[PDB]
Structures are given as C-alpha cells and as structure tokens.
C-alpha cells in the first residue's frame, strides 16, 4: 500500500521552519479532519483546517501566503482535496493494513517498593487497557494509583499501577489485565 | 462508538545555518518512517511495516525543497531574527522490569530540544559504549520543540552504573543522566 504525503505550498543565528499535515480521525473513518501548519521559528504563522474551508493566517506574519493561496483555484482546490487523497487514502490504505492491525502481548509482573504493591504492565500496542487489583478474591479499588502510559518508542507501552495495602502473609493479591492483545484476561498472582 | 487515532503525515523540518533537514511520518505519536535525504530512501521504524506499505521517497525531498525555499523567504520577511535556545531534559529508564541476567533495553528520553541539533551518547561506568545503541528521528512537540529517544540494550547487573550524556547548545556543559538498577 502506498502512502501519500501532505504537500507544502510555496511562500510569496539559527532558523527553523516547520510544515506538517495532520489527519484527525475519530471513530475510525466516521469523521475525518485535515490540517496543515507552516511554522517558522517556533511561531505557527499559516494554517489550513478541514473545517474552515481555506487557508487562514494565524498570525499577521502570514497574511501574504494566506491570501495568495486562496486566490488561485489550483492551490485552494488541491489542498481541500487532500482530506481524501491523503487522510482517507492512507487510513484505508496502509494504516488499515499495518499500524491499526498490530497487537502486542503485555508482560505483567508484580513487585514491591512501608510498602506499595506495584503491578508493572509492559510492551503492548493497544492504547487502551484495563488493570485491576484484587485481594483475596475481592476487588480492591482505593489505594490504586497509575503512572501514565509511557510511550517506549518502539510501538509499545509501559504503565504502572500502584496499591497501598501493606501485605500480610496469608493473603493473595492478584493483578488483572484486559485486552491489550487477547480475550483471556491475563492474571498474575502473588501469594505469601 | 467514538474517539480514535491521529496521524501526522508529512513532518518536514529544516534549519538554515547548517542546511540540515529532516522528513518524517508519524502515526499516533509513533514514528512510521523517515526519509533519508542522503541515501534518498525511505526508512521504516518497524521493518515488518515496509513489507506491507510503502512511500515514494521523492515525495519527501520535494517537501524539503519546498520548506527550504520558505525558510529563506520567511527569514527575509521577519528581517532576520534568532530563536532562543532551550534546555533539553533527559530521563532514563528501562523498557522492561530489570531481571538480573535477562537482556533488557535502556531508554534515554530527551524532551524539549531546540533547535533540532543534539548529540546523545551512552556511558557504561565511565567508558563510552557503541554497540546496541539506537536512536530515533526527532519527534515533534505541540509547542514546536523536539524530543528524541535514544536506546541502549544491556544486561542488568549489581556492579555497574549507566549514564546518558546530552550535548546541546542550550547547555554550556553536558548533563549526563544517571541510572542504576538500585
């Protein structure tokens, strides 16, 4: 599947320029939204929006570029088309065959660090996931903390779910995990 | 139903004083691929991704050539002005819990970088290591800054300390981050 790009339009001591086209999907392909940004220094000066209809200068430093590109049909009409030729295309194209359909099994492990039961869940590719702490069959839900999914960077996640409960020999705490890969809730236990 | 994905298709960056450029594609914050402006080929973060989808590298060099132009114009239209340098922020950690003996990867996060010009290297005990050291392209931050991730695979131990030294113009002196299994 070939993916297509956004196409930066022409303009009428360190310096850094930036351009990027963004495709905001929601519900999958239900509602699409396209946006581009032309960023000079660190100030985004020119922008396009899938909901406004044409280019609009976000700052006065880009009045020129904004006017001109909305005068010429070829430009204005082209950009307004990327919603389909870039967003929808890519989605149904490459994504729906690569990013999207890629699952990863989580590696759940309990441990300790005057103590807090930690339940580290790692290396999974589904944003969503449910981690529930259980006691001797009862679902604890009071001293339960979380640490914000950390994007590892290699398309895997890592999160930590704490628990206060100072453990007393005899009880069995169990870490519960939901579909970040399968449909058989993984369950790590810790006796003693 | 509702709420889902986001894809940046077409991140084009470019610095004038050094003629440095970078082209990348990210989906959901993760980097799909980046185009190599020298070797003129598309490179995939995840190799099993190329065997399914693809990208015309030339479609990258073009946006570099278009942004190069605009850089130039926009420098003249603001009467030539600097951009204050920022102070990068390292944060080291492991990819998986540390289980002595079992190979693991070590991640050196480096948020808030600007301009996109930085040297990140690793140090075992004190000596600089070179094997198993991976690094990503610059990812973008909603405040138009950049963050880069540098990896290092290792074998967890009791007798050793790792470090991630970060060099940047926004630092008169490098500031290695310290990390031990402790």
């Amino acid at each position: 599947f070939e993916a297509q790009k956004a196409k930066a339009n022409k303009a009428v001591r360190h310096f850094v320029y930036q351009f990027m086209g963004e495709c905001y999907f929601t519900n999958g392909t239900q509602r699409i939204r396209y946006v581009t940004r032309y960023i000079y220094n660190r100030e985004e000066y020119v922008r396009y929006d899938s909901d406004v209809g044409e280019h609009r200068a976000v700052t006065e430093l880009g009045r020129p570029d904004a006017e001109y590109w909305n005068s010429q049909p070829e430009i204005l009409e082209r950009t307004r088309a990327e919603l389909d030729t870039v967003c929808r295309h890519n989605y149904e194209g490459p994504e729906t065959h690569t990013s999207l359909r890629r699952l990863e099994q989580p590696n759940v492990v309990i441990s300790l660090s005057h103590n807090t039961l930690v339940c580290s869940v790692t290396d999974f590719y589904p944003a969503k996931i449910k981690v529930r702490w259980f006691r001797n069959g009862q679902e604890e839900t009071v001293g339960v903390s979380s640490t914000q999914l950390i994007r590892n960077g290699d398309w895997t996640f890592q999160v930590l779910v704490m628990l206060e409960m100072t453990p007393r020999r005899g009880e069995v705490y169990t870490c519960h995990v939901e579909h970040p890969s399968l449909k058989s809730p993984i369950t790590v236990e810790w006796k003693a | 139903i509702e709420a889902d994905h986001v894809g940046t298709y077409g991140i084009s960056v470019y610095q004038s004083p050094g003629d440095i450029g970078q082209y990348t594609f990210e989906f959901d914050g993760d980097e799909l691929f980046y185009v190599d402006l020298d070797k003129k080929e598309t490179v995939w973060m995840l190799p099993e991704f190329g065997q399914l989808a693809s990208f015309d590298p030339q479609g990258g060099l073009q946006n570099i050539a278009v942004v190069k132009h605009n850089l130039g114009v926009l420098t003249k239209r603001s009467n030539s002005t600097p951009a204050t340098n920022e102070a990068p922020q390292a944060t080291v950690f492991p990819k998986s819990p540390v289980l002595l003996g079992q190979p693991n990867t070590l991640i050196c996060f480096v948020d808030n970088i600007f301009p996109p010009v930085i040297n990140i290297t690793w140090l075992r005990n004190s000596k600089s290591v070179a094997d198993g050291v991976y690094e990503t392209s610059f990812f973008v931050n909603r405040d138009y800054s950049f963050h880069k991730l540098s990896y290092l695979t290792f074998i967890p131990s009791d007798d050793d300390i790792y470090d991630c030294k970060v060099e940047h113009w926004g630092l008169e002196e490098p500031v290695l981050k310290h990390w031990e299994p402790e």
Partner: T-cell receptor
Amino acid sequence: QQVRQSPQSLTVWEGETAILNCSYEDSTFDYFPWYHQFPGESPALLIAIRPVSNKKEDGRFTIFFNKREKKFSLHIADSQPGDSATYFCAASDNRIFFGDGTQLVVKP
Amino acid sequence: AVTQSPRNKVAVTGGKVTLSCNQTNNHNNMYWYRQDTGHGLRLIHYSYGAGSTEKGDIPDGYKASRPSQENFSLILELATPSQTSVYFCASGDAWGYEQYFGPGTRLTVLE
C-alpha cells in the same frame, strides 16, 4: 508507475468525436493532465482533472475519469481539422509521467 | 519563459555535448525531456532547486546540472547514436500544476 496511451494514431472525419484512452497503475496520482503538441513546436497543456469524474473546459473537450477502474479518456466533440496534433496524457504526484502519445488526424 | 540554447546541433559519437536552458519565471522546478517517435516524452533529469538534481525515467548516459535557480543544463559525456532526437526543457512549480516547455532542440549523433 507508468501511464498507458493506447490509440497510437487515430483518424476521424470532421464534426466526429475522437476518443483517446489512457490507463495507469500507481495510486498517488492526484493530477491527470493532457498535453497537445502541434506538429510545429513545443507541447502545451490542454485540460487536466483531479479525482472526481467529468471535466468541461473548452466545451469540445471532456475528460472521463474512472478511479475505480484507474482508466480515463479524452473526448473531442466536433473534431475540427486544426485540432490535429500529437496528444499526450499524463499522471502526476511528485512529478509528471507521459504516455506514448496519440497522433490525431482529422480528415477534412 | 524558457529558452534552450543550442536549438540545433550535430556531433560525432564520443563528443561532449552540452545543452542549456534559461528560465525566466519564479519556478523552482526544471525538467529536461526527450522526445522520440513511439515513446513520446520521457524524463531524463530534473531539479527541485539550484544545486539539486534528480534522475528520471532514462537518466542513463546523461548527467545534468543546476548552477542557478534559473538555469538547468543537460550534459552528454560520451555522445552515442542512441541519443539522437529532440530535447525539451520545461519549467514549473512543485506538486505538478502545468509545466512550461521550451522551443526544442534537435541533436544528431553519427560515426
């Protein structure tokens, strides 16, 4: 990654309708233009089209684009004898690709 | 508009032929085509800007240059009979809009 122009050479009487067919394979082409080159000099642009069938321009020419089939053709209604020129269909994304060309000849 | 230099040229196999192409627009892109009968227009080289230059369809045998942003020159090191034809030099904007061609150039190569 290359376009196909079939009618190598074509001939039709005045007033008649000439049809020149093209077919491509790549799917990043978001611009399909047509160039006419008179037997005298350099080629020029005639009519182009972007994804979404039908084109009016210079009411005499019409472009039928079929994305589902990745086929498009150029129709010339009431073909005059002066519209005899080699016709090149093209497909563009990063750059342009042309076809074999069709040498049209409208017999007077 | 654009204007090709040698609008006509005859050479022997092994000669160093050089074609020029002065542009006079604010176009950054410049392409060097090559027309023949049965094949039509085929791209040999093109450049997105001065100092830039990309190969095209049949770049073999050639090697172009882009010294300024208003001049793109195609260059034949070792001419060959297989290089006889008409060469066109176009100018244009990025993302494909309309390429503006040149008058043309006829080149012939013989032993």
